[PDB]
């Protein structure tokens, strides 16, 4: 319920619950009804039954590392320049054999063995020059592997997806993009609160084209990736953010006003009901009701840890291996044919 101009006449009339309470169709409102200023003019709200605020609700996302390949932290030129670099070093170690002071095939096997950390190969160069060359080449197979691992683990560290909206002072909320659809429940306290502000009203023009016809439909549409953010109370969002394990409230409450039983401005019930609620908040009756209905958790702790590498992103090396077996069979036919 809120204040709206009628379609045909001139006077303004309330809507829904407020209209049915004022126009002699209801003597009490037993339901979550946030106390406001535009409603306390004609209604006498008792002391609040439970406190809450307005918070956003976004869908939880899969971390999704998105590695997509192993030669990912090397740039295709560096992977090729290193290979001819093994051979140049291999052919140099081989050429440093005819001159007086090792076999060329074995010297090129040894450069492959020292940079792939493999254990295959046998024999070491005997000349001092080739010995120093291998001594510095070891130092370079290790700078390439230690450098490939620090680059892989500094792009796996800085792979944060984004930063969700926090509170209401987020600049992305005061001026949102076109493909950032997010709205609220039409005719509520959040609607009046956004229509009252100055710049939040300039954003509320944008929300206004689509606002759900109810909180349930909005919660259903948030899961279907049709709504990007839902601003509502937080007692209902905390119950939505627990049961479904894919909904989480990101922002902090910025409108602290709780619900309250509200009857019309003149009735005797108004006085005894505020004392029953004050007396029953103190002797833990409301705590019992909260433990019975509102809070039984089923999903929590917000791990938000980074992504674990799956077989969809680390399949390049398996393709490389499978490829190694297939070329190995053609090489066995060449070995038999060469022999």
């Amino acid at each position: 319920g809120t204040q709206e101009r009628v379609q045909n006449s001139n006077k303004k009339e309330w809507n829904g619950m407020m209209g049915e309470l004022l126009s002699g169709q209801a003597d009490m409102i037993v339901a979550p009804l946030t106390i406001n200023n535009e409603r306390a003019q004609y209604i006498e709200f008792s002391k609040p039954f439970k406190y809450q605020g307005l918070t956003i609700l976004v869908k939880k996302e899969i971390p999704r590392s998105t590695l997509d390949s192993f030669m990912q932290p090397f740039q295709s030129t560096l992977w090729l320049l290193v290979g001819l670099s093994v051979h140049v070093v291999a052919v140099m170690l081989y050429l440093l054999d005819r001159f007086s002071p090792l076999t060329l095939s074995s010297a090129m096997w040894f450069s492959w063995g020292v940079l792939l950390n493999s254990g295959i190969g046998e024999g070491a160069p005997r000349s001092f020059s080739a010995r120093i060359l291998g001594m510095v080449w070891a130092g370079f197979a290790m700078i390439i592997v230690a450098s490939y691992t620090a680059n892989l683990a500094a792009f796996l560290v800085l792979d944060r997806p984004e930063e969700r909206i926090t509170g209401i002072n987020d600049p992305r909320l005061r001026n949102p993009s076109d493909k950032f659809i997010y709205a609220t429940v039409k005719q509520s306290s959040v609607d009046i609160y956004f229509r009252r502000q100055v710049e939040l009203s300039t954003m509320y023009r944008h929300m206004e084209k689509h606002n759900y016809e109810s909180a349930a439909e909005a919660i259903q549409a948030v899961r279907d990736n049709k709504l990007h953010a839902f601003i509502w109370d937080s007692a209902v969002l905390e119950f939505e953010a627990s049961q479904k394990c894919d909904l989480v409230t990101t922002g902090e409450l910025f409108f602290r006003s709780g619900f309250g039983i509200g009857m019309r401005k003149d009735s005797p019930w108004k006085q005894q009901v505020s004392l029953s609620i004050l007396k029953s908040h103190e002797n833990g009756f409301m705590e019992d009701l909260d433990k019975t209905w509102v809070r039984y958790q089923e999903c929590d702790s917000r791990s938000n840890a980074p992504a674990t590498l799956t077989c969809e992103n680390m399949a390049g090396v398996f393709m490389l291996v499978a490829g190694g077996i297939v070329a190995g069979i053609f090489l066995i036919f060449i070995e038999i044919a060469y022999k």
């Binding site: 406001n36 493999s118 683990a153 796996l156 590498l309 069979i329």
Partner: protein, 377 residues
């Protein structure tokens, strides 16, 4: 000024008055005795959160005021059927209004009217911040079971290729167990193997298995180094409803938790919790400062007080060595209000003005000035 909502600074020494931020509050306290009518008149000037609320209320409502501070009381406890403090000054038709921290309840609402609560206040626990250690299952975390089972099946099929190699060209046999040990070693950086006999498909085949071992191992290390960094979170207790408080003795050497005796929190606890009140009395503590000092030296495990004072204390603490699990799980969440005269006509107007403040969003600004601190992050 017994609460961090209104403060007392005597007077600016530049002009002999106070700045245009505070409001002159007359500290009309009876100092020595009732020998004379001297109220110890020293014109101070109070400021803070309740002062700003009061100054906003008077402009939104046309009235004036003069702060008769206090005489013989703090908040007002019924003694021999007589009220003192703020409630005592209001009930004797001498104040007609009261502001600050009233912690609205039934006994005060019995004889003194109240407006709408402008801030929440209940029973929040205060514990030290437990250091966040790494999960016990973290080494086997940065790689899913799919990666391990494929690596294993690739090892098996490469062993099959190695046993097929037995039909190679002319150049201790190369059995299956030897190749398995050689490939098991080559992925955990080395053990002590005996390798392919020769045969360019065999040496090549182990060499490209070594290239998948170098990438797999420099990728696990990177992924382990990226989890260890980001993830960190822990919680000491869930609140007063957790088994840590309901069953203190059913644990390691039991926790210690107590509040300030002769107060509101102790009264409720004793009213709705017998064993809890007994255990709290078994570990009673001194004032809030002594309680903070005891929490800093590792003597108390949990402090019990009102939510607002504990939040203010934790916001401005040295570093962030204090926590308040609090938040949603606060017990007997009452509010602070403006104690209007019983059956007065200004109650409706002042509560409507408070709700209007609430409407536009100035109280959030007041909270961000006077209620947040360094550990707001």
């Amino acid at each position: 000024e017994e609460a961090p909502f209104v403060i007392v600074e005597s007077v600016d020494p530049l002009s002999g008055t106070c700045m245009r931020n505070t409001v002159p509050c007359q500290k009309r306290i009876i100092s020595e005795n009732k020998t004379d009518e001297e109220p110890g008149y020293i014109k101070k000037c109070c400021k803070g959160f309740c002062i700003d609320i009061l100054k906003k209320i008077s402009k939104s409502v046309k009235f004036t005021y003069d702060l008769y501070l206090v005489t013989n009381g703090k908040h007002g406890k019924k003694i021999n059927g007589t009220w003192n403090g703020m409630i005592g000054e209001v009930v004797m038709k001498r104040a007609y209004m009261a502001v600050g921290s009233l912690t609205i309840n039934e006994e005060r609402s019995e004889v003194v009217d109240f407006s709408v609560p402008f801030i929440e206040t209940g029973i929040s626990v205060m514990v030290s911040r437990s250091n966040g250690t790494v999960s016990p299952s973290a080494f086997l975390e940065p790689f899913s079971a799919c990666v391990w089972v494929m690596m294993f099946v690739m090892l098996l099929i490469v062993s099959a290729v190695a046993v097929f190699v037995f039909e190679y060209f002319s150049p201790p046999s190369f059995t299956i167990g030897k190749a398995i040990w050689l490939l098991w070693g080559l992925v955990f950086n080395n053990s002590v193997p005996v390798q392919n006999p020769k045969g360019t498909t065999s040496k090549i085949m182990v060499s490209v298995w070594a290239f998948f071992a170098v990438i797999f191992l420099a990728s696990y290390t990177a992924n382990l180094a990226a989890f260890m960094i980001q993830e960190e979170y822990v919680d000491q207790v869930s609140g007063l409803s957790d088994k840590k408080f309901q069953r203190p003795n059913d644990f390691s050497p039991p926790f210690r938790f107590g509040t300030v005796p002769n107060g509101s929190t102790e009264r409720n606890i004793r009213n709705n919790y017998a064993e809890m009140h007994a255990y709290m009395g078994k570990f009673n503590q001194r004032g809030v400062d002594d309680a903070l000092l005891s929490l800093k030296t590792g003597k108390l495990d949990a402090f019990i007080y009102d939510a607002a004072v504990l939040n203010y204390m934790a916001g401005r603490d040295e570093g962030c060595k204090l926590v308040t699990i609090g938040s949603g799980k606060v017990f007997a969440s009452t509010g602070y209000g403006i104690a209007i005269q019983k059956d007065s006509g200004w109650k409706r107007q002042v509560d409507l003005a408070i709700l209007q403040l609430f409407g536009d969003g100035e109280m959030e600004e007041l909270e961000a000035l006077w209620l947040t601190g360094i550990c707001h992050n």
